[model samples]
Target: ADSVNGAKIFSANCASCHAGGKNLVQAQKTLKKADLEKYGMYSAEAIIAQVTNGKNAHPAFKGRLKPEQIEDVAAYVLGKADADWK
Candidate 1:
């Protein structure tokens, strides 16, 4: 748990692309509650899978991040989804 600094990881890796939950690369699918639900991406597990497996332009984090890292990041995203973001 302590090893998984999701905020730091997000700042380093996902911030550039997913700042404020909005996808710089894919604007249509922001990380907001509505968007996540609409896209079936509201769950931590689903987010984890996407982070690990990736899709389209997104790169895979299978080797770059561990399972806890993935889960932590997913939790961060899900937890912050409803908060004000850009």
Candidate 2:
């Protein structure tokens, strides 16, 4: 059930703000393992909630993106949790 097409969705919609898993808006809380761990924003559930509801400058994609697509993006981020974005 997890096709994991998150890469494509992330690149298309989320890349503008979070390109390469880097957060340009905040300059912090990047999708990196250390940052995520330090900020306590790691895990798919956290990411899904944040992405779904939107936080600070991050806009809510709940209406724009399908539920499954959001989960896919979360999986993608979690899958590459330890990998460096740049």
Candidate 3:
């Protein structure tokens, strides 16, 4: 996945609710590595699945976002989480 494009996509689509890996709506269900792992959303497959299908308060991007775009989002998210969003 293109890290550049992923960052762009995330800023446009996900930043509103998930900036800095924090969850605005669900405070405890953040995108931080520890929270993601605790909630079983730590892997690319899990994130891709979540983005594609949505869950809880999250909106589904299955038709709204292209598959590769979702993949890139997952990659960017994992990368940022690994780096602690620094």
Q: Say which candidate scores most in lDDT.
A: 3
Per-residue accuracy of model 1 over 1-86 as CA lDDT, tens digit each? 33248777888879898887788988998888899899898888788888898985568998888888888888878777856443
Model 1 segments beyond 4 Å from truth?
A: 1-4
As for lDDT, the candidate ahead, 2 or 3, is 3
Q: Indicate whether candidate 1 or candidate 2 has the larger lDDT.
A: 1
Winning candidate number (TM-score): 3
Q: Which residue pairs show backbone clashes in model 1?
A: none
Q: What TM-score would candidate 1 get against the native?
A: 0.85
State which candidate, 1 or 2, has the greater TM-score.
Answer: 1
Error of 2 at 43 (Å): 0.6
lDDT of each: 0.80, 0.79, 0.89
lDDT of 3 at 83: 90
lDDT by residue (38-81, candidate 3, tens digit) is 98999999999988888765779887789999999999999998
What is candidate 1's local distance difference test score?
0.80
Clash count for candidate 3 is 0
